[PDB]
Coordinates of C-alpha atoms in Angstrom, one line a residue:
Chain A
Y206 CA -62.5 113.8 -93.0
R207 CA -64.3 111.7 -96.2
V208 CA -66.4 108.3 -95.8
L209 CA -67.8 106.5 -99.0
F210 CA -68.8 103.0 -98.2
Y211 CA -70.8 101.1 -101.2
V212 CA -72.8 97.8 -100.5
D213 CA -74.3 95.5 -103.2
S214 CA -76.3 92.8 -101.8
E215 CA -78.3 90.6 -104.4
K216 CA -79.8 87.1 -103.4
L217 CA -81.6 84.9 -106.0
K218 CA -83.7 81.9 -105.2
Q219 CA -85.1 79.6 -108.2
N220 CA -86.9 76.4 -107.4
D221 CA -88.6 74.2 -110.0
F222 CA -90.6 71.2 -109.4
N223 CA -92.4 68.8 -112.2
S224 CA -94.1 65.5 -111.3
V225 CA -95.9 63.2 -114.4
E226 CA -98.0 60.0 -113.5
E227 CA -99.6 57.7 -115.9
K228 CA -101.0 54.6 -115.2
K229 CA -103.2 52.4 -117.8
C230 CA -104.7 48.9 -116.9
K231 CA -106.7 46.6 -119.6
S232 CA -108.1 43.2 -119.5
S233 CA -110.5 41.4 -121.8
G234 CA -112.4 38.0 -121.3
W235 CA -114.4 35.9 -123.2
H236 CA -115.6 32.1 -123.2
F237 CA -117.5 30.5 -125.6
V238 CA -115.8 24.2 -122.6
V239 CA -113.9 27.1 -123.4
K240 CA -111.9 29.6 -120.9
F241 CA -110.1 32.6 -121.7
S242 CA -109.2 35.6 -119.3
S243 CA -106.0 38.1 -119.3
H244 CA -105.1 40.6 -117.3
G245 CA -102.7 43.4 -117.3
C246 CA -101.6 46.6 -115.6
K247 CA -99.7 49.2 -116.2
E248 CA -98.1 51.9 -114.1
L249 CA -95.6 55.2 -114.7
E250 CA -94.6 57.7 -112.2
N251 CA -92.0 60.2 -112.7
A252 CA -91.1 63.1 -109.8
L253 CA -88.1 65.8 -110.0
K254 CA -87.2 68.7 -108.2
Chain B
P95 CA -35.9 125.5 -82.1
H96 CA -38.2 123.2 -83.4
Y97 CA -41.4 121.3 -81.2
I98 CA -42.7 118.2 -82.7
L99 CA -45.8 117.4 -80.2
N100 CA -44.4 118.9 -77.3
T101 CA -41.0 117.8 -77.8
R102 CA -38.1 119.2 -78.1
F103 CA -35.9 118.8 -81.5
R104 CA -33.1 119.8 -83.6
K105 CA -32.9 119.9 -87.6
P106 CA -29.5 118.5 -88.6
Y107 CA -27.2 120.2 -91.4
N108 CA -29.0 117.6 -94.1
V109 CA -32.5 118.0 -93.8
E110 CA -34.2 120.6 -95.5
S111 CA -37.9 119.9 -93.8
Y112 CA -39.3 117.6 -91.9
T113 CA -43.1 118.1 -91.2
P114 CA -45.8 116.2 -89.4
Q115 CA -48.5 114.9 -91.7
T116 CA -52.1 113.3 -90.3
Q117 CA -52.5 111.6 -94.3
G118 CA -54.9 108.8 -93.1
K119 CA -56.4 106.8 -96.2
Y120 CA -57.4 103.6 -95.2
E121 CA -59.1 100.6 -97.3
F122 CA -61.4 97.7 -96.7
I123 CA -62.9 95.5 -99.7
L124 CA -65.3 92.4 -98.3
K125 CA -66.6 90.1 -101.4
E126 CA -69.3 86.9 -100.5
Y127 CA -70.0 84.4 -103.1
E128 CA -72.5 81.3 -102.4
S129 CA -74.0 79.0 -104.9
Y130 CA -76.4 76.3 -104.6
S131 CA -77.5 73.2 -106.8
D132 CA -80.0 70.4 -106.3
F133 CA -80.8 67.6 -108.5
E134 CA -83.4 65.2 -107.9
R135 CA -85.0 61.9 -109.8
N136 CA -87.1 59.3 -108.8
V137 CA -88.6 57.4 -111.7
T138 CA -91.3 54.1 -110.9
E139 CA -92.1 52.0 -113.5
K140 CA -94.5 48.7 -112.9
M141 CA -95.8 45.7 -115.6
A142 CA -97.9 42.7 -115.0
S143 CA -99.6 40.0 -117.2

């Protein structure tokens, strides 16, 4: 009475997360009747999982 | 006289030998497979002037 049982259990888990966010805003105004105004912002956001 | 499992048997003239044999051999094969795949992306962009 012989018995031979082989079990090969394998589990693999891998997870990667990366997020990049960059925001830059620049505004300049000069007046000397003369009036000048400039306003502009930029926003960038990215996320991957 | 020929007895097999307490039963009276008679060997015919054509059969040479008929002997009981256990000879128990069973097989069982089980295989599993699983795969996971996930993808996520969300990009945000904003501009103002």
